[PDB]
Amino acid sequence: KRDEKHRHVVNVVLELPTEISEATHPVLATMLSKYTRMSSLFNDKCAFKLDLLRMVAVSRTRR
Amino acid sequence: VDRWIRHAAGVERPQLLDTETISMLTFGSMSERNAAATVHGQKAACELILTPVTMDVNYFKIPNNPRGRASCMLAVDPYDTEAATKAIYDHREADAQT
Amino acid sequence: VDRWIRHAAGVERPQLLDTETISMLTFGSMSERNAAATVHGQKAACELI
Amino acid sequence: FFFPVGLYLPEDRGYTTVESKVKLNDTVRNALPTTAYLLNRDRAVQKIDFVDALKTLCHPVLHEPAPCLQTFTERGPPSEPAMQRLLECRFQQEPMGGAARRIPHFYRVRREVPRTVNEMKQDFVVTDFYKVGNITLYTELHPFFDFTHCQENSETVALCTPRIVIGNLPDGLAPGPFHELRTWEIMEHMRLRPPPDYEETLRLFKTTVTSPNYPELCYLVDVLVHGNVDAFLLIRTFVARCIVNMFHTRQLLVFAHSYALVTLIAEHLADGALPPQLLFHYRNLVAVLRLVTRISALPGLNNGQLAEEPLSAYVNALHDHRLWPPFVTHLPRNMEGVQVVADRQPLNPANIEARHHGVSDVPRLGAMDADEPLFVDDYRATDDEWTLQKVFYLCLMPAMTNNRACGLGLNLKTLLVDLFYRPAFLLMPAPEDSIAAQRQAVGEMLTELVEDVATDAHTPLLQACRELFLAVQFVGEHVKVLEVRAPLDHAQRQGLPDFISRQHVLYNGCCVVTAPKTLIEYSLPVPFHRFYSNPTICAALSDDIKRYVTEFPHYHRHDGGFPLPTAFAHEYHNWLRSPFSRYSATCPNVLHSVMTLAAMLYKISPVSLVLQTKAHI
Amino acid sequence: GPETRPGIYVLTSSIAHWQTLVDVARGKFARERCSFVNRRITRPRQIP
């Protein structure tokens, strides 16, 4: 299925706090559509965290 | 860049030397042709050697050897070629003149 | 410090041997060799006080 | 008969044996001579200048040291022990991938480093350099080339290299004040004899760059922007607030360290948003760069091109694309002979991948620690901006800062996560509570970074830190140390055609003047050049360098003699080498010394000789 | 060319021994020698 992989990519790789969920962030869901593609890089979690961070930044600009 | 340098100074294009046999047959090429006219005398060949900007100006107010170290062969002992070469080349020694 | 100061001054080590040094103290010896060339006169070395 | 032309009497002993019979105009042409006059067959005076000397000075044989190298090799290394202690020196070629990571590993060993022959040649004052007490004099065989001995494979061999710029000449052969007087000669030829009075901006620049109280976040935003124009456009309102608040709270001019920040401010913030005086200071700095650029070339005589390369590049190294600025953030538009080395082999075009922001581009963020791939903006620096950046970093900085600067990198992958990854940033609408709640929510380290640097009554701390956060999309990668390998121009090549010049530059990093105390835990230092290698900053940043320096207190010298890591220490193959560090160590902090470093750059090539001589310089 | 028109020269030289003069003439006239070989190949019914 898909639930276990998404739970991994949310609570082990990205390590979001529980108060942040799919319904709170549309960009996070549209990005998890991509993040589940690669099964590697699940040790350098800092890279995924920074990627989500800059994705939020680029999503929130007024330009 | 070679052509540009040949143009920058008033020098002609390069010219190959004569071969061994022709050099033995003919006694010289005299590349610099005789000038058209000359009121002053024979053109004094002025040669340039390189020099630091901060050489001792006192060097020139006296008769002197124009290569830094004096090398007159009446000074060194006769037929001691090793000592003569030490006096003219071996830079670690204390030289003649100043 | 002796090695460094000898190098900085430009004078060689006491390479002298035992029999030559006892002869040098008692008799004297030509411990300095001749210079390579001389266009000027004798090396009238100055003494500094 | 024999006669001298263009000698330079010492200024330590200036004297006039005749004053009542002659008096001359105060033009520097009379102060520094460049001609000689002699009597003809009859009593008539004739003029000899270097232009007549060009017929022999430009001849190829003068620039061909191969027989000199052969006879030097046959003469062999001197055997006397005084020569022996100078003889011992070693160099090694190294890969560049791990060169930034391994600096603490190198410095951990307590071993000393022998001084190179060129470095030893500088110490003597001019009147002692010719005396027999000088050991290194035997190596000074030719004015246009260096000669030195080196050890590899346990054997001693001779090494030769060309003196790319006239400034390379040793101190005893051309003293420091002589370069100042020739700079005055250049100015008088250009008829800029009284320099434009940018002096007050230079004093403020001195006091702001030498101040140990530089704000720490200045380096962080400098890394983050990369100098990318769109990145700086987003922050532009943050920059104005920070700069005005900093200038009012401290009389030191902020963001003055990096060229990209300076020029981006000078253009973009000119729109407004600033008190006019600070913008005037920055425009004056840019004008100083433009003025020294005009001095660098010979615009009066400079015209035409040769081998599809501009004559200015032949005249002065500041216009050669083959000389890179010590800190690089954009690849130059011009690359013909230059090879860029990031690892064991020069980079093919396929290996240079494009950095595009906005899109996730996650594998690049994963592979930032990697060595082989080199990431660039979809952007290139124009040649004029290349010259401006080169002159800002080489020319202005070590002159005004007295070589106190240093290079460091920021560990972005962990730093930006540890800073911004609070939920307060992740949840933000497409504040106002209380200062204590703001400081608790944002993150304490970001608070101590920002608390009073970039906040005003109009924008509390949380809004400002959110504003800085918005620019993170241009994050970039870690730092790298790049090697530039290039043969010289088509004219300098003629002597030693095999010769390759090896140069080092730092990519995606800052030039700093003080240790960022909060970032000390996160940041790493990397001294890499005869400039930008202050041991104080490095000892502050890393424990191993502090241990190495405290084991050898003498190495504390700011004058550039501090041993670089052996991968950097190719002093004979660098363009700049020892004289510029030694000069920067003593030079006064005025515009004249700045412009002097640039006029000192003139190249040694025969074409450069032709151009310089035709100007009568 | 299409057909052979001849060249004429009168020359002065310091060389007396014949084979040395033939060597230098070959050195300076290599184009003509290659042209002769080209004539031999291009028109085999003709023999210069």
Place this chain on the structure above:
Amino acid sequence: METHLYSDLAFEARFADDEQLPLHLVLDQEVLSNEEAETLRYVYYRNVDSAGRSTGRAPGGDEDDAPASDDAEDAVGGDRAFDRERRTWQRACFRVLPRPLELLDYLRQSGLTVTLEKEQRVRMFYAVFTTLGLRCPDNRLSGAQTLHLRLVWPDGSYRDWEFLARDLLREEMEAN
């Protein structure tokens, strides 16, 4: 330039007897330094079968395949084995241009009317011209074949490196 034409004609001559086809090379500063390019003496080339062989040795096998004996008398079959090794190497003509030049302008100053797929300028500080052969046992040519290029200088030093025929022929043969 003349070396390419002469070697092409010579390999046309020898093809009927030993079936080598000619390959034309030009080398620049990325290959060798100016000093060693100015004093170049010899160039040598060799072909290898896919499984690993040589042109001179008997294709099936040879006594050289045996392990080294490390004895005192004959280290490795001295005279006969050295004769075989010098047999397997082959020499080719070469001409070096020590003056710097660009390929397209030089070729157009020569008789060759070069019309490349694009007029890509290339600048070489010094150029050497060389033609090498790679053999096909019949009119079937295998891309897995490896080629050797040797350069020799008077003092006995040498440098060499290997190519894959699939890289050299990657598109030129694909058209045919």
Place this chain on the structure above:
Amino acid sequence: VIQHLPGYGDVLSLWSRRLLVGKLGRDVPVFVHEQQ
């Protein structure tokens, strides 16, 4: 295809030369502005 032409306002000429010497095996150059 043609750089300069008399009264109009050479890669074609030399390219035609190469193709026609490949065909004929004879050196009769036919330029764009020389023959009819």
Place this chain on the structure above:
Amino acid sequence: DEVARTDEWKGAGVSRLREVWDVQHRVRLRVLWYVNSFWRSRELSYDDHEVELYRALDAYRARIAVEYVLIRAVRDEIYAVLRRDGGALPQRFACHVSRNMSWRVVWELCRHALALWMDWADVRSCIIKALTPRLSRGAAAAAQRARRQRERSAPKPQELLFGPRNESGPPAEQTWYADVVRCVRAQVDLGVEVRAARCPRTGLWIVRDRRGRLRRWLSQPEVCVLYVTPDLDFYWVLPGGFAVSSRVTLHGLAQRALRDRFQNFEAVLARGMHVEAGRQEPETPRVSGRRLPFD
């Protein structure tokens, strides 16, 4: 009337230009293709079946394998003979020794040197230079002559009194090639050439440079050095002149690949070099660009 191949060749010209790297990506060079080449007319066929490619790369790996495996055989000999002796090293190179020294630290430095040298193994190392003259044609004849000469009965008084004088024996001055590794700063030297002799007072070795000066490293605590003889005998030395002895077991390699990789290539006559064997060569030919070429 017909033209020669040369003129139609020059007319037809070239149209393609490709750049190709070598296998190791060390050097890149270009290839030219001529449209008029007979290679086009032959219409030969081409294919690159993958199994042949795999065989080719495996054989290439076996080709570069020749020297690294020899280095590893040197390692195996060192460790095996160290185990066989059981941790006893006789002194072999003439230098004085001190008793009141922490020999454990120099043993640890020997371990570090052994580790460091192997990481920097290369074809430039000593043993390749040692095999370099062994492969040439003269080596076999010289070895035969040497074995015949050394295995000789003492001459009778008859032969000494009359006829030829005492036939010349081998010289003491031997030639060695060496690797030296320094541990104080991790760097190695791999292409050294050194003179050797046997000390007259005691049979230990003395090492000197080709300039004649006596060599210093044997005293330095931080250095361990490697020797190999021109008859492929092996020595490893740690500070104090204590050595390990073995013979290089090069029998792990096939003769074909060993000869293929390297040999002292013999020359053939070219312009300027003597027709008589062994004469002094005149000035090098050196077709040059620094000067106007001669014609």
Place this chain on the structure above:
Amino acid sequence: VAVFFEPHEENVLRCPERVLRRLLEDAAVTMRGGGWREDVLMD
């Protein structure tokens, strides 16, 4: 004044057991590691 032993062909250097054990263990680890340089180049 310092004192030293004169070199001779017979004097021998001993080896501690622990250091020899360390050397042999390192030899075994390096032998079974398979860190061949040729494999790195082929990679």
Place this chain on the structure above:
Amino acid sequence: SLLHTFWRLPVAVFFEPHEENVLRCPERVLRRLLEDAAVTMRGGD
């Protein structure tokens, strides 16, 4: 651990260190050498 010396009694050293080889070992220097070498060796599928 200590070596075995052929001569029962040692001898006095003389002459400069370029005609016969003698090793000299300050214990502190040797400890620094060991530590530096061990660190730098590590410093330098």
